[PDB]
Amino acid sequence: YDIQAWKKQCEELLNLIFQCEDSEPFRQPVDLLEYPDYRDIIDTPMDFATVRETLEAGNYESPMELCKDVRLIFSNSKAYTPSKRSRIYSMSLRLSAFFEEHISSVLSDYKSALRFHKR
Ligand SMILES: COCCNC(=O)N1CCN(C(=O)c2cccs2)C[C@H]1C
């Protein structure tokens, strides 16, 4: 019932993600010179460094907010990829499954802790 536990859990999960080779394309903001049409397609850029920074700044209130930004990384990748058979797309899908598998208990524990708090 620890309401704050999510934060270290998410720090640990981001560490795992940074160790995953599949995260390499998603670790830094897209270079807008290198992909000059990016912002024509993507309204809200997001990357794992930004997520980690936001977390470490104390600018997430909940794991749900972190989970929304991480999912945006994957939706951005999926939207910019020209093919479902692309390398980056395939990496997105794998990393997303890994993330979703690990974030599920973080979310459940948090929501459970909050419910207990308001019981
Ligand atoms: C020669 O192969 C290069 C392959 N790389 C790419 O196509 N990209 C990098 C990933 N991406 C994204 O949307 C995001 C990067 C950060 C977070 S989401 C798509 C695109 C810019």
Residue numbers in the entry: 1316 to 1434
Structure paper excerpt:
A striking feature of the diving products is that they all have a methyl‐substituted piperazine ring. When looking at their closest lateral neighbours based on chemical similarity distance, it seems that this alkyl substitution is required to change binding orientation. The aromatic 5‐membered rings seem to bind mostly via hydrophobic interactions within the water cavity. In addition, the cis‐orientation of the two carbonyl oxygens was observed in the diving products whereas the lateral products displayed a trans‐orientation. Individually, none of the diving products could be unambiguously assigned to either (R)‐ or (S)‐ enantiomer: all relevant variations in electron density were no higher than the standard deviation observed in the immediate vicinity of the protein model. In contrast, taken together, the electron densities for the three repeat observations offered consistent support for the (R)‐ enantiomer, revealed by a paired sample T‐test at the 1% level.
We previously completed a crystallographic fragment screen (PDB deposition ID: G_1002162) against the second bromodomain of the Pleckstrin Homology Domain‐Interacting Protein (PHIP). This multidomain protein is involved in various cellular processes, including cellular growth and mobility.
